[PDB]
Paper text:
The PotD-PotABC protein complex in Escherichia coli, belonging to the adenosine triphosphate–binding cassette transporter family, is a spermidine-preferential uptake system. In general, ATP binding, hydrolysis, and phosphate release trigger conformational changes in the transporter, leading to the uptake of extracellular polyamines. Here, we report structural details of the polyamine uptake system PotD-PotABC in various states.
Thus, the PotD-PotABC complex was formed by incubating the purified PotD protein with the PotABC E173Q complex in the presence of Spd, ATP, and Mg2+. The architecture of the entire PotD-PotABC complex reveals an inward-facing conformation, assigned as the pretranslocation state. Notably, only two pairs of hydrogen bonds are formed between the PotD N-lobe and PotB, namely, the main chain oxygen atom of Y56 and the hydroxyl group of T58 in PotD interact with the amine group of K217 and the hydroxyl group of S220 in PotB, respectively. In contrast, the interaction between the PotD C-lobe and PotBC is more extensive. Namely, the residues D212 to E222 in PotD are sandwiched between PotC and PotB, establishing extensive contacts. In particular, the residues E220 to E222 in PotD interact with the residues K127, T126, and R145 in PotC through three pairs of hydrogen bonds. We observed one Spd molecule bound inside the PotD. In the pretranslocation state, Spd is enclosed by the N- and C-lobes of PotD in a tightly “closed” form. The Spd-bound PotD in a closed form interacts with the PotABC complex to form the entire PotD-PotABC complex in the pretranslocation state (state 2).
Residue numbers in the entry:
A (entry chain D): 16 to 373
B (entry chain A): 15 to 374
C (entry chain E): 26 to 347
D (entry chain C): 5 to 253
E (entry chain B): 7 to 279
The structure:
Amino acid sequence: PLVQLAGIRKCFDGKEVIPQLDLTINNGEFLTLLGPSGCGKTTVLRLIAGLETVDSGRIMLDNEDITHVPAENRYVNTVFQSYALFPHMTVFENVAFGLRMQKTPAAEITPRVMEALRMVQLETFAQRKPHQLSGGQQQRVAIARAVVNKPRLLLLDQSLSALDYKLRKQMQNELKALQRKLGITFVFVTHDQEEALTMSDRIVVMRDGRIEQDGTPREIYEEPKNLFVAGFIGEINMFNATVIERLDEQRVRANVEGRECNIYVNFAVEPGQKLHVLLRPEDLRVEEINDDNHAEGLIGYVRERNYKGMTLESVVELENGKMVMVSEFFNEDDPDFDHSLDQKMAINWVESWEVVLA
Amino acid sequence: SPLVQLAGIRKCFDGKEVIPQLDLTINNGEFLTLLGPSGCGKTTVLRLIAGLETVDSGRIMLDNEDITHVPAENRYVNTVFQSYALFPHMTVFENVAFGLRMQKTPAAEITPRVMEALRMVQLETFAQRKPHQLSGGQQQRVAIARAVVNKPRLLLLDQSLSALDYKLRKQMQNELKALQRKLGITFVFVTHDQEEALTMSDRIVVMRDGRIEQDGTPREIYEEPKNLFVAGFIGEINMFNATVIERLDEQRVRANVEGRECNIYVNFAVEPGQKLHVLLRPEDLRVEEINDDNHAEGLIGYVRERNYKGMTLESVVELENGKMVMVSEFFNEDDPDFDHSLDQKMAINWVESWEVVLAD
Amino acid sequence: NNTLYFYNWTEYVPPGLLEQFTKETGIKVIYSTYESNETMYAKLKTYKDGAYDLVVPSTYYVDKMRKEGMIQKIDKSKLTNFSNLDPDMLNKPFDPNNDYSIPYIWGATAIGVNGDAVDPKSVTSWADLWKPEYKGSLLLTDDAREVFQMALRKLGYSGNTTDPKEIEAAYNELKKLMPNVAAFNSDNPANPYMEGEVNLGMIWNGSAFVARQAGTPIDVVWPKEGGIFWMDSLAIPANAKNKEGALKLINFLLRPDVAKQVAETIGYPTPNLAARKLLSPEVANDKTLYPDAETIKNGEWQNDVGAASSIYEEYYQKLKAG
Amino acid sequence: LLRGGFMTAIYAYLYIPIIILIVNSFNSSRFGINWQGFTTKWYSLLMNNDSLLQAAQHSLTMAVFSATFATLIGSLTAVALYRYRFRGKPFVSGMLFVVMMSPDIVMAISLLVLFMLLGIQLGFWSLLFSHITFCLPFVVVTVYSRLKGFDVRMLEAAKDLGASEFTILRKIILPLAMPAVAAGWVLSFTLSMDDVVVSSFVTGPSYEILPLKIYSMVKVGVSPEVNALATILLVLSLVMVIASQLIAR
Amino acid sequence: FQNVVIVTIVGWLVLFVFLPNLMIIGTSFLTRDDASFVKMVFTLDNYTRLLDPLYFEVLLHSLNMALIATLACLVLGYPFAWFLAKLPHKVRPLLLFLLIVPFWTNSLIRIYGLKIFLSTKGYLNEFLLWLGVIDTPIRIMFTPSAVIIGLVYILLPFMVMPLYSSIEKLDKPLLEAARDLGASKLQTFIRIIIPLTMPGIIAGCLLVMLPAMGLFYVSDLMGGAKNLLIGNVIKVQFLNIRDWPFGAATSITLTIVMGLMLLVYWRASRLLN
């Protein structure tokens, strides 16, 4: 363990933002905190960094208590959303600030700064003020400033949010490679789902100052734990179910949205219980019906279609009046296929690729 | 059916030529999107149509009436801006009714129209609440309502939905498509995003340095690229270099693509020894991982990254050449779950006749 | 029903006097103040042609101001109160027939001292001020003639001198007194005494009266080298609009009752013989306001110099900057 | 705290002489060094003082006129800068900054020589022009900084909706600017009240104003009518600040 | 209209601001005359008289008394504006407004009031007498100290307002970022806060030092004979002695300082943007 948190509380203007948190951070992992806007991720990041002081609890770093050490003495460095980047100093002095303030002997400042600038591909822009660089280069200067001091934990805070949609794809992989090459923990704060899924090795999902789920992306996307998590990342379809009778230990009989078929369930039920049915849009099969044979699935309709390039996404409406939003792929046996509007449809899923909740 | 016709527009600003020479036609009842890199002159075209700038040579036509020198006060065109351009001291009702008041509408007809315009956009109850008490989405909605109540012939939009978040943007895209279907008037939409261009458009124009590169349906621009820029702009493409050996039959040609020989499909006439460009998408590459010197048909490369997006799995595999190619494979088939290592050795193939070969 | 502009000295008109005049003739009067003769001179030449209606020059400029053409005839028939004035000070060489000025108020200037700090006997002559024991504490008046008719009477000369060798003898000797001056006051030379900052220096006798009618023992010790005497007169500038109004105000200040109400409050000796008698035993008796006939003839009056005016002034303005 | 002690001192330093000119207004000693009882004689003596009342009247009329015209011209200039963008804008901004960073004695002597060469008598008009001249920049800065906090795209949006160039002024720009137009009129009124350096140079005997009359009395230092005239103008100044806020909204 | 507004504003500035300064620089060179105040004859005699030790030690003493007032404003006003920017947002408009209310009382009377408050027999000597701290009074009139106190007392609000904007307009993240990297409260002040706020410091000295050499009534009421400011010299020349060319030649020591301090403002503003 690198950082242990024990019973943290923090209050702001009389309103609570962090009730209780116990969280452990290991050595050499890429951790991400994901949640809705303004849910106390920033406060936890600042407490680890040292820019705020706790009301109760304990923070430990390799078993040395750091609860009341000042911010300028910890070995944790932080990267900001707006790339702090003092405007009146060149890139070289911006990087060398930390070295100068820690009484580094003057013999080695130049090599260390140059190596740190090389880690991020900014060798040539060493004498250029931080207004004649572009956005990405400013991001890189901030990261290099953070890394040169050899910290034990890097905190990134909406690091890549202002950049366009191709530079973000490049820089996510760049950060992923840098983390492996260095060997120290990266804590990341984000509000986007795809970035959290693609860049991380472990996810902690937070809502209003409490931890909801904590695990690797496979676990959170495939086997959620409640309705907030299953619905925060990825689009999800919720179907209301009422149980009729049990068939065996793996299959159960129930009515869902007017049709009565069998749903796989793996917990104890009694007749009359209400259950929740969840399905991802990609795991849901669809087939047009023009003939009079209306069977094998719910009725539905189509109100909207969207050519995604790679995929095709439709919004359907059942007999009740609920949207299901199915997604489809382009295979060899079915290239170029398209829908019309108000085409009567037939919806069915793929036999045990669902999760059912209490 | 012709509605707007740009025939020979020329425009310069600060001694620089921004629109060299542009010929374009806009139909009635459709949904057109102008797409390109930042600062390729989409904004200037939109402004020239709207009336906030004047041309140097050429004529702009609206329903067989020349409007090249009618000010931005008598044209039947309305515009939606990017900062929402809201008057902060007036109420929502006054913001919407401004356009009516400037046209001398009888006092008895104002309120029902304003309430209808607020209703098409779901702001019935916020009629008497000033801005700065509204969220971002609601300011966008009020701007659209302010635009539409005058009954224009063409509603121009300028990067309208960029300041919002993800799910709300994804909702309001469908909202806009529904509105366009209801009203029956042409929508012109300027954007930098590729997915939002493919999702909701019915005709796409791609602009780079003032020239129209291509025009057509989204499937025509994603499946039939005309040059390298269009292929690499929307979506992701894999550029390959190939050299031609000889012909096989009326529809196949031998080639030396990245060091090995493989049958490719080239429709047009080919002579040995020329340079070809083979373009493939991460859509179409099929990859199999080879353990111990078995089934080594195809290119040989090594994996460097692995990115799980929940529905698919992208991996950048680097070839022996040193070339990075993007692979995208899905879980929707009966492969429940899989994952790669960081130095695993892979074989690359692709499905027949799904290539795109370009000359020069 | 017109109005007049009255341009006068600092502390002559007491509050209320001009309010009386209005309710008697219907004329409104606007009032301003001097601090010296050179300031009055410059004002009248910049804003020429009708800026003022009634100046109050000192007698030793009534001759100078005639030839430049800034004073005019005074019609002497409507001035029907002239007789009450003292005939003693009424025919002197500067204005023979009194067609140019009418005497207003005279006065004196001698050493002032504070009893609570300095003994009024330890200083008795002008020369005691040059002592090197009074560095940086001495109030001096701010008139070129007064400051110069003190070194001339110290070395021994006539205060009314027109010789470039005695005036230049004054400067060289009066420039050794500057290491002792702390202020140059000519608006109310009693305030630095009443505030507690200076305790020795030149003082006008009338101003020391006002500080003894309040709480402070300022004693006017006369110097052995003499005493500086002066007189002021009323005049009408050449280009004026209320010609009638200017006369009707001089005719009001020559009345006995008017001239004694002011004379008692300000303590400056009056040249009005008629009102010189109707007075209090503390105003019309004090040795420092109205002196004997032995002291008036031991000091020198301020007479005209002529065209050596500039030499006195030009040396003065270099003495200040030290 | 000692932090509050630092702020307590600076306010006491600035507020002690103000209290003295109020305490000594009701004092009876004509000099003001000590305390000698209570009286209301001085105010009544002021009420009959013709010269000082005329001087105060001239001060008020000049302040009103100068403030009004300066507000109008400066507000229009700020609208011109906010609405349009051209090449000379940084140059004009620098011109205004340099004018505002200018010594007052140099301005006084320069306006004296200018009015002497052309041949205009010193009096009412010269004082008016000088007051407008040194009041403009503050009006310009205030209105422009008020307007700079809003989107400029409103004006294009108004044009697209079918509005003339004059209707934009009445219905959009002017309502957004009134809270700063009023703050400029009051600020201009304040300066023209207590300006001493320029007035001492560029006015004559004809039109006399309060700084000059107070100067003489303060040097002579015998008349506490001055202290009483000061406390009236403070009350009259605090009612305009309050009245402006009600009218501006 | 469109161009009338721009034409009038540049017409006003050319006639009333910039052309008259060239008139003064031009008249610093003509000869004296008793009729038209000038006579069209070119001399350098006016400038040579300034280097006379008689009329040159006055400028040096007038400049020492203006710096010390200006350094006093920085030392006292910088902490005052820094503490005020650390208060609840609901009380700031109260304390700022209570700092501007003195101006509605005439400035010429507030100095006369301060003259009483520091006299030998006035208040603060009798009050501080009977509370046993001094044996004999404190005399601070007619001394260089008196004029400096009067200068600081009037011109202090002109230093707080420019400093207040440039402190309130700092980016908070910049201050937090230095704290992470290992910077104490002293190195944060020397190496970040001072350079970011330098254009606000130079602006203050412009509004304090230049008027401090033109306020002739602090010297009239409180200075005496040995303590003069330049503003007194020009008033004496232009209205009593009536030597306009020498009076104008004195004013140019005041335009030179305006130019040099403005240059530092343009150059120190570019370093930041």
